[PDB]
Amino acid sequence: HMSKAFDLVVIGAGSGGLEAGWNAATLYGKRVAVVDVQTSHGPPFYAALGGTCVNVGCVPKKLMVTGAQYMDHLRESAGFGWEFDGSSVKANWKKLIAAKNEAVLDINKSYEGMFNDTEGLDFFLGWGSLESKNVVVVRETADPKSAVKERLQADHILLATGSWPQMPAIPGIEHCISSNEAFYLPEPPRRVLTVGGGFISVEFAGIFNAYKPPGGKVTLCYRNNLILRGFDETIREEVTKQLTANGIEIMTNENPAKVSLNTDGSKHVTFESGKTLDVDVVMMAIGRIPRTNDLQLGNVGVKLTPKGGVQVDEFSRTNVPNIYAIGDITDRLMLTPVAINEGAALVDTVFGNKPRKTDHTRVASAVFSIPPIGTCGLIEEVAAKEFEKVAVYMSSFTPLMHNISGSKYKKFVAKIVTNHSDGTVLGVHLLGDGAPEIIQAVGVCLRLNAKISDFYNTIGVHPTSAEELCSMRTPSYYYVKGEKMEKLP
Amino acid sequence: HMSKAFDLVVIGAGSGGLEAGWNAATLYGKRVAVVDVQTSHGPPFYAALGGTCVNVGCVPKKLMVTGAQYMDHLRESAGFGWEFDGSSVKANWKKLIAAKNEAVLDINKSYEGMFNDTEGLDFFLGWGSLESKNVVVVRETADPKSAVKERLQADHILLATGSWPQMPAIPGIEHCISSNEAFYLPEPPRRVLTVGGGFISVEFAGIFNAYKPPGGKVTLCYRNNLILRGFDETIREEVTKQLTANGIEIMTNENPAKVSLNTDGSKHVTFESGKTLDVDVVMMAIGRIPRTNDLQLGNVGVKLTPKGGVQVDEFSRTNVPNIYAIGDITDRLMLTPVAINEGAALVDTVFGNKPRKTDHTRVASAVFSIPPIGTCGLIEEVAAKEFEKVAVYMSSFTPLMHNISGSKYKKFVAKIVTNHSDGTVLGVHLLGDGAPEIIQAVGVCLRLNAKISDFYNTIGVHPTSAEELCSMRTPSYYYVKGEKMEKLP
Ligand SMILES: Cc1cc2nc3c(=O)[nH]c(=O)nc-3n(C[C@H](O)[C@H](O)[C@H](O)COP(=O)(O)OP(=O)(O)OC[C@H]3O[C@@H](n4cnc5c(N)ncnc54)[C@H](O)[C@@H]3O)c2cc1C
Ligand SMILES: Cc1cc2nc3c(=O)[nH]c(=O)nc-3n(C[C@H](O)[C@H](O)[C@H](O)COP(=O)(O)OP(=O)(O)OC[C@H]3O[C@@H](n4cnc5c(N)ncnc54)[C@H](O)[C@@H]3O)c2cc1C
Ligand SMILES: O=C([N][C][C]C1=[C][C]=C(F)[C]=[C]1)C1=[C][C]=C([C]N(C(=O)N2[C][C]N([C][C][C]C3=[C][C]=[C][C]=[C]3)([C]C3=[C]C(Cl)=C(Cl)[C]=[C]3)[C][C]2)C2=[C][C]=C(F)[C]=[C]2)O1
Ligand SMILES: O=C([N][C][C]C1=[C][C]=C(F)[C]=[C]1)C1=[C][C]=C([C]N(C(=O)N2[C][C]N([C][C][C]C3=[C][C]=[C][C]=[C]3)([C]C3=[C]C(Cl)=C(Cl)[C]=[C]3)[C][C]2)C2=[C][C]=C(F)[C]=[C]2)O1
User: Fold this and answer.
1) Which of A471, A472, A474 for mutating ligand 3's site (highest number of atoms within 8 Å of CB)?
2) For the range A266-271, what are the long-range contacts, defined as Cβ-Cβ under 8 Å and sequence gap of 24 or more?
3) Quick check: B459 contacting A, CB < 8 Å?
4) Which fold has domain B362-473?
5) If one looks up domain A166-286 in CATH, what number appears?
6) Which fold has domain B2-165+287-361?
7) Is B42 annotated as a binding residue?
8) What's one GO BP annotation on this UniProt entry (chains A, B) (predicted)?
């Protein structure tokens, strides 16, 4: 019936909080408490022990995109001489969802095990909030009036509560779902609208498109001209064509104004334009917002940015000296490995006596579109605002295997962006099979300040898509003080 | 006086020959003649315009491995909810061969077009040999007494005739085939013996295993204890295990003593051990030897190594001034990209004022086994004879998608070999889906003298197999003065 005392209390057992907690306890012998709202994935709170990534993010979406790729594989097999009864082919969504659920539960169960087993690393179930500088309260619900399960005394407090889907305030929003519900749909939708131009909308569009019943149709809508803002424009344009080529309708310059129920219970969507669409599911994927609401940060005066994130310095420190924030709650790069790196850096700094800041530049990342994106570093239009002379090396071709497969639309894109003044690689952008696998080691290259000549003097592995990166010596074009041109004056 | 005058005569229109020829003409404005024995692929001379890679190597074999992969994709799809009539599934070899033939013939025609469209680059059909220091004779056939077609006066001669399958001197060797004939088999063989432990025997075993008719069996035999000599030991053991899991019988410590014809037109193999096996096809893949016999190298005194390669210095010069050799004929690294690099280097040296030598260390390479190998730099047993303290970082697991697919045997292997005294990455060895793509940029990393800490300080792309390379911090074991031990002494 007594409070417990820790060196470190972590609110959120996800990618950042688990890295921080494990490292503090096992590398530096600190007493660590980690709080989360649920021990295993799914409703009601979706995220759980292991975080968004394990439960309703990276791990399950990747298993589901892997399942969806078999639609391409089954059709593309025919060109290589594979024969079977095409009329017999069915996509069983319930088996996919059941296989994903057992894989996720197995990870939930192993994290549970690590906590029951490790010296000075304890798990507390419930909703963590800040009572004071040195006390974390664990309550039965997000409501600050719900019953107190524990009070955790903390010399240091880490906020790592991640993010949550954003729902626009439109009439009939209650007829719409987020990515969270999409993971548990009992049946694959015949007709689905995915709202948003980001990786989550694109990734789900691919998944629904493979698993849709026979009469089915996937529509993606986006309020602006071109999906996947922040990615290379050539790649943005090519992914649009390859989604369309695979039967996904892309509605750009369109946004839902309202949703109502038809008498048959299907969703009637009215866009701002006055266009209408009937679907069985409306999935909002317009963005994710920092999960700061439930932490009662007012109790200790932890400052939020204008945009809603916990404000931090380069060492993840809030304005309250012993309170830190890492991961999606800081509203910057929303990636698992960035959250993990921030967690490991924080603990080495606070407990390890070896200060270290996370480098947020030159981070490798992927989109598991079909086919996928792999990217690291600057897109050319950003490079062009910070460097007087920028060169772009571009190779774009239908791979030979896709001339046999019949997916001629599957153009491989490889782009390298440089500072032409010294040849430093600023950015590498890939579209096509293996692009996420190719881009990891490119991340090491950029952290070692690689120049285009470091790439072109490296001997290719043949035959691969990757060898295109080691075969480009003459720019396709330049930017000179922000202006695009084929040649230097 | 028809005879014609050239700066460079290249014998062999292959990987190395065409790089050299193209660069000499388009970069250095030289007069270039290139000789090959055939304009397009296949019987009777197999190699042709484009070289071994284009016609009977890398390109057709990758397309045929892509075909073989579909056997795994169709089975694995079931775990992700794909349902279809398994009984109706058949692999059509003839359709694969015809699709490969059209892809390759398109490349042959494109190279024809390249000669026609390029100034100072001329193609001659026929058999090239050395008449004197500065004359290349082109005859109708490999016979030195056949009709002369051209006599090419040349300031510089490039030997680039590549390699040829080694056939052992055993009774009934004439009832055996090589990789050359494998590319044109009218029917997929029902029982086949691939002879050799190297990458060609392993790749073909996979190809024949996918396309074998019902009741068929692929056997691979190797004269020593463990296949794929020169690859990482862990990967050699695991690929052996994974080939066995996919139904390929691996016969180690076995070597054909003789082959005889059976009355049904099948082959009767007797091993040195006294064991016997009946097969439809015996594919010998025990090695490749330099293609030097038809060149009449005795006419000018070009020196050969004891092994049969054309002896060259670091700049690809023979003992005879103004005569060079690149690619497989030099019997060093038999990889297309290495031949291409040597060709470029040679032309830069001879006709630029840019003396360049090919670095034959830290060349990335692949085996298109199912699943595949990607490797760059030293295996631990070679590292441990050149360095006092070697650390080995090792990661080995079934990827989660293969727990769902049911191919539980598909262990991904990642190994980093370091100079432990200073953390320098010496070698990276990968077995798993994507390994050939993951390894290309690793090639670039080893030219920026990456340390293990440069890998583990790089932020991961999640979820990928590749991120394993950025997640290994602690050696699994070491070699100290050549001797393996789990701990530093
Ligand atoms: C659909 C989807 C796909 C994604 N795909 C990828 C991808 O492929 N690659 C990638 O790198 N990233 C991906 N992401 C992003 C990645 O999931 C996040 O960047 C990462 O999980 C954030 O880690 P974190 O530690 O900040 O928070 P999280 O991992 O979100 O963990 C926060 C935890 O805190 C808990 N929590 C919240 N409030 C409280 C409270 N008051 N008390 C206690 N516990 C609380 C939550 O239950 C959760 O478990 C994806 C995200 C989504 C939604
Ligand atoms: C089955 C197989 C698979 C392979 N897979 C790969 C792989 O995946 N990756 C890789 O990097 N390497 C691979 N290789 C090796 C690769 O093909 C060679 O290393 C490369 O082609 C060698 O280039 P080269 O310029 O030395 O000769 P080649 O490309 O062989 O060119 C030699 C040319 O000379 C011609 N010729 C020969 N004698 C004469 C003469 N007297 N006069 C005129 N012309 C002549 C031939 O017709 C031929 O076109 C593979 C090899 C084989 C056999
Ligand atoms: O498919 C693919 N990819 C993937 C991989 C592979 C391959 C093959 C196979 F079978 C499978 C798979 C492809 C297709 C194509 C290609 C290439 N390319 C490209 O752009 N590239 C370029 C080239 N390279 C470099 C240079 C060299 C030279 C130049 C001139 C003359 C002669 C020579 C080469 C190469 C080649 C090849 Cl094939 C590869 Cl793969 C790589 C590399 C670069 C490239 C191209 C494009 C387009 C066209 F139309 C053509 C072509 O790709
Ligand atoms: O499947 C796969 N692969 C491929 C990719 C993928 C994923 C997912 C999906 F869905 C699909 C696909 C896998 C499985 C598993 C793995 C890994 N691992 C390994 O062994 N590793 C280790 C871990 N990691 C690293 C480290 C970190 C940590 C530690 C401790 C605590 C905490 C943390 C993990 C990670 C990392 C990173 Cl970088 C990120 Cl970003 C995330 C995560 C890894 C390695 C493991 C194994 C086994 C088990 F059971 C589990 C796991 O894999």
Assistant:
1) A471
2) A266/A191, A267/A172, A267/A175, A267/A176, A267/A193, A269/A193, A271/A221
3) yes
4) Enolase-like; domain 1 (3.30.390)
5) 3.50.50.60
6) FAD/NAD(P)-binding domain (3.50.50)
7) no
8) glutathione metabolic process
